[model samples]
Target chain A: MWQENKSWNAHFTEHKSQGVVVLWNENKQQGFTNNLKRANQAFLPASTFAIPNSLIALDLGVVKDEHQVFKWDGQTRDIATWNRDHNLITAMKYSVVPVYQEFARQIGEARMSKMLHAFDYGNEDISGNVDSFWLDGGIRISATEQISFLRKLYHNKLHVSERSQRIVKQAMLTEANGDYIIRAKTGYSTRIEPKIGWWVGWVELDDNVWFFAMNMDMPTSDGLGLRQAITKEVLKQEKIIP
Target chain B: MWQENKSWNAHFTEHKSQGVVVLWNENKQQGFTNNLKRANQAFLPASTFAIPNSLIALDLGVVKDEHQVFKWDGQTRDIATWNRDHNLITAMKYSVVPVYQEFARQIGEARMSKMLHAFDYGNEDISGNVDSFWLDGGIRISATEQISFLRKLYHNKLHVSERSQRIVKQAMLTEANGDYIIRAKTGYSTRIEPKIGWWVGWVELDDNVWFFAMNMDMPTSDGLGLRQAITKEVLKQEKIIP
Candidate 1:
């Protein structure tokens, strides 16, 4: 059962975009959907897959602690942040691709396959390039499914070690304050036609944990901040943060 | 008069490194120092110089808005974040050196000198390569001077346009929560003798802004995070953030 919130679509509409938002309240056993139909539709996880990629690396001891630095191979890519030495914390914060790609290579196809199926992430199909399947390959997850995966992550119910889950969760603390804490990730799919955008995470406030997954049709570079902009607008209206 | 908080020295001692911290309480006109001597000694500014690079670029219109994108030249740099397309925000957030170095080339030496003196930043030395003076040239700044410069920037008292100062300030924001917000920068003085590390910024909490500047001896890569670890521990002792 889903409660459809028609008014929530205005956040996307005001930006001349169309998107769906699914908010799951852990304690209430309730859910709110802005577009029920799209919430259940699958889309590329893109950089959001770093959430699981990090777990697989840590779970396998491929990466040490958050502070274990990687030597930059001195190869320039399309993004600037990816060119630097990185560990889990910095890599997660910037969503650096090469570092995560390196992580994929280290995780290897076999272990990656095992964990994807274990986490039940997306379609669990990394059928193309090991490093790029989530971005352009076959891995896709519905917003509803994203919430399900995150729910497990929140409670440390995933198949990986609890310490791995804890570390990944700590790295996801993008923003926090005295009153509330937010653990989340943002993803963009640029190469695929009909570029997709995602903002998925939970907001902890008012004695409850509210998890949200958002996906929007992004056609231009300007859509970058709109993912958080639109979501925060809703969060503001709901009195989540001042 | 500076109040010497000798207890603060323990933070550095426990880390097996030596350092100094200057905590200036703007509201009370009070200052706290961990080590009086080093607080006044100059060290390389390293990536901390990006604060002024952003201001100079924006003030001269060398770089447009924070969202204006630049294409990566496909040449690899040691820093991974520098490989892709970047605008002001992404570059500033990750301290992408090459992008700022490009800003220096566009800015040229003449204007670069004018603003360095104009802002009175760290001895105003730009005697060497236009792109790397802050990173490796003769320029150096003391912890005390850094706090002075940040204080002016904090109040928009710099020589640059208020808009430029505002943009640079906005770009500096690293984290926030409902109860408090932090705007800070970290610098690693690698490629220099007796490597130095820095964490400088202010914390906004309880309707007051407390400013701090710290520099440490970072002889190994392991010392990378001690700059912040030590500072945050002192902030905790002061009840800045729980």
Candidate 2:
């Protein structure tokens, strides 16, 4: 299911970013990428964990619906927008850290850990504060593993309720312009050495889905946009975005 | 300098988008595009005129510099970001209609029209409201003309003062990831039948520059991203982005 594409290396080199892209064409049941080694290498998932975190919350009834509001705690945070109230959709959109952190405490360690086992997510180690495991905890996920998990989520084949998966997908909507829909999550691990930027998602067009998970080392904040921009650049080359 | 590249037509067809892409390899002094006829067809430049407008403003001392802020007049606009104070850079970044409209008034028709003639821009018509000539007025430029205008500006060859051209180029900075720099502007004309979307820019890489201008009919607001997305798509296929 996997094939290496060396030609794509120039894209990484040109951007001054070193990373791996794991892609799966659902219709073809095929997987391909540029750096197979890096794709298999484990790294912190960061905000990308929001995808599964929201899913586990929905399954456990922590988030009753997309409209269920998590009001602000009046605590100051880095992103000013997160200081306000947020529903599941808004929390996912602005990436309201406090809201999701609250949901993690509600989920607790046991339920969250078990869900990862069932979902077959990452290294499955929720060894730190349950609320922050995916962020700074011991959990790690490879690009290849991310693709596998997303493929299951895309087909509703994960060990979770179909409604849970569907609502999570709806919350992941990042782009829905023209004939295509993009459902994805972006992850930034700023606390770790060699901070990694990630954009993991699947593209839906013409009844087919293309899954992708990319994580790259970001030297400075300026290249952060490179995460999604380079992904779309590669997608365009793959003719997936077209 | 223009040749048809049928291979790129698939990008438009697959996206359910039809448009023209005009490319000039500056180092080679050669040009190529996918559709010659469409490249030659004229359309409203819309916000793309902001490039030349800013240039003329700076040349005529209407705006002192990038740091000169235009304070919002308490009038609410469709885009929230533009409601606050904006400098030359912020104004262009947000495409603040009110800010540029004010600049248009300050420029007045006499000087604005004269500058267009001096810049040799488009059909050089500044008829109608001086403040809205490019939007609701009678100014139009073809994809081919857009390239010629950008090429001259890129080389500081526009009839405008060199400092004015340099400052506008500085304002046009869009992407600067690594090993590449993109300077460009995006335009949208929603008032017209067959609304037009445009993204005109030049990519600098390894001491060479590739200039491009694209305009397409956007049926719905959803397809607006296709303007820039498809341009990057073509650039990658041309091995310009990589």
Candidate 3:
């Protein structure tokens, strides 16, 4: 069940008050963590659960994927104009497995179909519902909180502010049968308000590893800094969790 | 003394939660009166000596200047913007004479200033000074009943909602010695968000008629609002106890 708790409250309140915060480092994605314990500890006991960090990272342009692929013709400023219409798979390091992909797995086929009921397949007819899913494992958090953390992560890694992050026109989470699924309406561009999506994951190994994996729902093949940050952090420490 | 009663508690809480509720009207010169009784009932009690029906006009916008100064020039795309800066005041139908002003006049200037100083006025800046002398002058009910009435009045009049109508902004109360003042920061534009400085006025009666004669501070020229709205319900009023 969605842990109705503090992390959610802190993130939601912060997002409403101060927009979003993103962080990134070098070519590495450093901000989105699968550290659910750390995330939970950020808020008081009575607070609500925040959106998953993976979705936040994707929204803020940290996650790289084939869907976000763009051939940067040295002469054109059209950043990803050519490949601006592809469905991309997103991945982030959650302990070891990508949690967002795992969330997709946990949601299963029937539930996923229900999640996308409002949209035609492949996200056509921008007005209609549009979403696709891929496997990635990570932690759970509210979309609002994820927006804050992902902004900080993207800025550090991609040298951009959260204000320049893409947008998500619609998002919904509901239960089908006994499983929960997220219905997302998304798009993308380098504009300050590009529409984006995310998938987050987390795992409690000997040491907890939190990961956020995400991508633009539009066509492109870029993962911004989605994988680099986790790999860099993992390489830096043989094992670190506290 | 600065009344530390429950009325202060209620007003402060609402101000903190929803910023400040301002007064504005479609006619630019006249504001809506549907909720004025509630706001007046909330503030007049702790400050008035004897309850009176005439005080209800204080919360309602001044009435003498409600008419638009210039005729609409049919040449503009939006008629409302034709003389955007010209439309400023909305006059009400009744006059609200502040009880403090009445009391100060009876006692003369020296005694009035001394009494105000005793309440708290030694600071260099006027920020901490009680600039407005509010006098409660209507019949009083029991304390419990009054508090309940105050709550409902605030909810109906000042509560923020999708349909909230903007009124005055940064409105404040001030007392210069014994001179009672109602100051509001109004704006030049006729829209809901542009309120700027303090709309100030002194308390006094013209001839035998007890009314608040507003001395408006505007950009082009000074203006006045003579008529105001007064409630007929005596039992619901607040009485000032010296």
Candidate 1 residue runs with Cα over 4 Å from true position: B1-242
> For all the predictions, what are the DockQ values?
0.12, 0.01, 0.00
- Candidate 3, residues B150-217, lDDT tens digits: the string is 22222234322211111121011111111111222111211122211112121111111111111111
Q: In order, what lDDT does every prediction score?
A: 0.85, 0.84, 0.24
TM-scores vs. true structure, each candidate:
0.55, 0.52, 0.18
In model 2, the runs with Cα more than 4 Å from the true position are: A1-242
Candidate 3 local lDDT, residue B15: 24
Evaluated with lDDT, which candidate comes out highest?
1
For model 1, fnat equals 0.29
Which is better, 2 or 3, measured by DockQ? 2
Worst 10 residues of 3 chain A by lDDT: A169-178
Docking class of 2: incorrect
- Using lDDT as the yardstick, the better of models 2 and 3 is 2
Q: Report the C-alpha displacement of residue B200, candidate 3, in angstroms.
A: 20
